[PDB]
Design a protein around this ligand. Structure first.
Ligand SMILES: CCCCCCCCCCCCCCCC(=O)O
Lengths: 171, 171
């Protein structure tokens, strides 16, 4: 229901997601974007990646007791973006400092010794673009690695060096 | 014009397409979008869909002797948009009356007794928005079924019924 909709995103319902219980909202236009990797399994198909979105969310909700999967968005290697908390709800990916002043997107998989296909990178940037068009993101926006803000290897050596060559990337 | 690049499209190089020998351009902004199906085998993974787009292009160039894949864009059930002749080049999808004044989008598969998945419909729709934003399509552009402009079943009863419900569909 109620879809138009931008950057070709797989809606929560499409991926058979449990419902959110999160309330805290993000004050848009948002300034930062933090890229992480789930550090979980990778997947390269609509089917496999939906099952992985579930797996990630399930771990976050049933096990860490969170109100919803931690990320605002998840990127699959199938080149599709999966809906997490979204543009409006504050995420849980970067620590109390960074969670309310940024959107966090996560690439499903471990990218330490592996690199994400061009399509996933496309879906990523394309995702950010839609964000500006929406007022959710800030056109002047800045990109940061998960590791650029938290003692963590995330989003992986391989992927980390790519987002640095991104134009909107700041260190 | 309107600089920022739009949406996620799998480029030619990526699905391994033969080089295009087409030269006749379209006059921007285009007023019509004609939707068809390939009535060929469907595909639901980036991997399998790239092959299929190739099979379709192949069949058009090698067997029908066209300058390129007939469609301007192809949609896969993997939820991805496959680049063909693209926005600026007259295609070969709908006859001499319609090929000079329209964009042809084809859904890979036969949608007579199957509907395409939401991710497919979503990609197709997001693409059209991309066209508008770019100025390749009129903001008031009109979507037509292939059967509405030529005598064919394509784009399939199921998919035809769906596009009828689109904001820009005019029989
Ligand atoms: C290049 C970046 C993406 C731009 C693509 C065009 C954006 C138009 C599509 C916006 C979605 C239409 C509905 C409005 C949003 C909503 O209802 O939530």
């Amino acid at each position: 229901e109620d879809p138009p909709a931008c950057g070709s995103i797989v809606p929560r319902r499409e991926w058979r997601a449990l419902a959110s219980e999160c309330r805290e909202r993000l004050t848009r236009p948002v300034r930062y974007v933090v890229v992480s990797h789930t550090a979980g399994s990778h997947c390269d198909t609509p089917a496999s990646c939906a099952q992985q979105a579930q797996n990630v969310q399930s771990y976050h909700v049933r096990n860490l007791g969170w109100c919803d999967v931690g990320y605002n968005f998840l990127i699959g290697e199938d080149g599709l973006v999966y809906e997490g908390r979204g543009w409006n709800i504050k995420g849980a990916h970067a620590g109390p400092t960074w969670n309310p002043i940024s959107i966090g997107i996560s690439f499903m998989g471990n990218y330490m010794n592996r690199v994400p296909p061009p399509r996933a990178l496309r879906a990523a940037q394309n995702l950010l673009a839609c964000g500006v068009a929406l007022g959710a993101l800030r056109s002047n926006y800045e990109v940061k690695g998960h590791r650029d803000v938290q003692p963590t290897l995330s989003p992986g050596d391989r992927l980390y060096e790519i987002i640095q060559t991104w134009s909107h990337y700041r260190a």
